[model samples]
Target: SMEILQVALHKRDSGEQLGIKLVRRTDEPGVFILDLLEGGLAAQDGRLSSNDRVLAINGHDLKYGTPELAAQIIQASGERVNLTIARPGKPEIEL
Candidate 1:
């Protein structure tokens, strides 16, 4: 099933933080979450997980995104990011 999730990471006085790892497959254009940092925003939110495909970021289509492009978009999102993700599963069971 496809799920659209929005994540807003607040920038502390010290710095910004969105603790997660994104990876791109050489054979594919889609980017995926490689890992979610246990105590980070993505992890704590409990929606994003490893193997989830990233279809878009902040309304920008990422169907053909390269790792570099994805990184660039994410870094530029500032304190707010809207992610459209596809998580493999039975849609019937999703609800």
Candidate 2:
């Protein structure tokens, strides 16, 4: 966690966008581990759920592979990047 909460501070001092990452942890990769249902633009749509693991965005693999690069990739996306996320007991949601 941040000491001063850079995100919150930035929000207060400037009207910059606050990039947030949502994820869940589970033993099963095919199941509900790393759900992107909170923060960022995804949350506002109200279409994402708790079992989604981002697969790709704008042709980029959302699965970081390692080094936790997914969050960085999401933040670097200008304006917006097309997102692909798995849904619980449902089809993947693309936005």
Candidate 3:
């Protein structure tokens, strides 16, 4: 079970672009992040990662947000671009 993850990347502390990539793989219901193009860009600073599943942006929900609108939501969000995400659980087991 994907039992871990929650993120809200605020663009304030990050002076540069996230340089991240998002893709909706086959049969998947929502957007998922792929291997980050520039590892040092967002995942590094924002704590994002490849398996992060995008949940919502503003009022757009993943169930309705296409990659196009998703991109717009982020791009249009400007300096306040905030996203809701969740990813799989990992080792070190106990929370």
Q: Largest TM-score belongs to which candidate?
A: 1
Candidate 2 lDDT score at position 35: 36
Q: Which 10 consecutive positions of candidate 1 have the poorest summed lDDT? A: 6-15
lDDT of 1 by residue, 1-95 (tens): 55565555553433455777888888866888899887887777777877788888878988778668877886776667678887776545544
- Cα-based lDDT at residue 18, candidate 3: 55
Candidate 3 segments whose C-alpha is farther than 4 A from its true place? 3-6, 10-16, 39-41, 89-95
**What would the TM-score be for candidate 2 when compared with the true structure?**
0.51
For lDDT, the strongest prediction is: 1
Q: Report the lDDT of model 2 for residue 50.
A: 56
lDDT of 3 by residue, 1-95 (tens): 56444555556553545567888777767787786765544666666777788788764787545677787677666565556677776735765
> What stretches of model 2 exceed 4 Å from their correct place?
1-21, 24-26, 30-40, 63-67, 90-95
- Model 3: lDDT equals 0.67
TM-score (C-alpha, index-matched) for candidate 3: 0.69
Distance from true location, Cα of 60 in model 2, Å: 0.8
How much lDDT does each candidate structure score?
0.74, 0.44, 0.67
Better of 2 and 3 by lDDT: 3
- Poorly placed runs, candidate 1 (over 4 Å): 1-15, 90-95
Candidates sorted by TM-score, best first: 1, 3, 2
